[PDB]
């Protein structure tokens, strides 16, 4: 979902 | 001010703790790697081969330090 985005 | 092993958020609201946190191979500047209470990660402590620190799969993720709440 969206809030791992920029997260690896 | 983070430590590894420390209780924390990520968005404030994906509970996990600290188990990484330096400079990674993936991206420049420093990455704090979580094991999260659910499996909604993206990882299990390694990205592209390289081990950070090790979680069960899905458990584990890097985000950058300033996304984290003590
Ligand atoms: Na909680």
Not at chain 2, 3 to 14: I, M, Q, T
Request: glycine share 14%.
């Amino acid at each position: 979902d969206s809030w791992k985005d920029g997260c690896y | 001010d983070f430590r590894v092993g420390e209780r924390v958020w990520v968005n404030g609201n994906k509970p996990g703790f600290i188990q990484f946190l330096g400079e990674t191979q993936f991206a420049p500047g420093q990455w704090a790697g979580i094991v999260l209470d659910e499996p909604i990660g993206k990882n299990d402590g390694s990205v592209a081969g390289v081990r950070y620190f090790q979680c069960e799969p899905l458990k584990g993720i890097f985000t950058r330090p300033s996304k984290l709440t003590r």
